[model samples]
Target: SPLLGSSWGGLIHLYTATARNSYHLQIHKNGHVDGAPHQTIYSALMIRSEDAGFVVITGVMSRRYLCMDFRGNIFGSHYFDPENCRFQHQTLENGYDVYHSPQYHFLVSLGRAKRAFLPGMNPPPYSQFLSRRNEIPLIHFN
Candidate 1:
């Protein structure tokens, strides 16, 4: 939970689960999302936690926010609407965190499973996955 962490803000590069690739989540100045590792300011992000079970990721270069849709699609936008930009994340076993929407339950993953999910309907799988994902070290900064 957000209550169990500190250092709630910093720069980070969102690494994806797809291995053997050269793509990273990069936000453009015009509010768009793509998988490119240019290492420019567009590739870096300023992640901030609201300490209320949600987080906001802003482009360090673009100054836009990473917005996730109910369908689990991610994009960059200047808008600060919580529904469009705020996210709930959990670090995985490899120290990489997977982000999802608290309202929709879709995950920000890549590959064939980018938006694939079973939702929080049954509660156990979602809770179990969430617990495992958050069981990693304190996730605030990169």
Candidate 2:
């Protein structure tokens, strides 16, 4: 059974993948099912290695967000855009909120990093120059 807030267009289905044994990606959408609303959005799964054979994962939908451990145990959640950004306490960290940009039809994930680490072997260096330079840093960098 699909989790709460995981509704998608009737025609849409889920898709999954494993990236070089380093990450497992799952994408869901309502685009595949007949009669599914064209405007419907779906959630996705994002996971990353935490340690040897261990992983950190998150579930994202239009209405809710959740994170989990490798064993599928829920760890945290929020009402942010899980389909677009990773789980982060943006509102708690800063007094800002997600807002819809008229120019961009979708609601922007506030306090989220604009730039992301490119997916490839030998990940590229963290370029502070090109990385998002927002006034508020989304994921804290050491």
- Winning model by TM-score: 1
Among the numbered candidates, top lDDT falls to 1
- lDDT (Cα) of model 2: 0.24
The digit string of per-residue lDDT tens for model 1 on 37-142 reads 4344565676787775578878767878888777777778877877768888665555445567777777764344445335453221222221111112323223
**How does candidate 1 fare on TM-score?**
0.66
Candidate 1 least-lDDT 10 residues: 126-135
Q: For each candidate, what TM-score against the reference? A: 0.66, 0.20
Candidate 1: clashing residue pairs, number: 0
Candidate 1 Cα misplacement greater than 4 A, ranges? 1-10, 17-22, 110-113, 116-142
Residue-level error in angstroms, candidate 1, position 35: 1.5
lDDT of 2 by residue, 1-142 (tens): 2323333212221121111121112223322111111112232333343433333233333222333222222223443333323322112122222222222223221111223322252211111111111121212211
Clashing pairs in 1: none
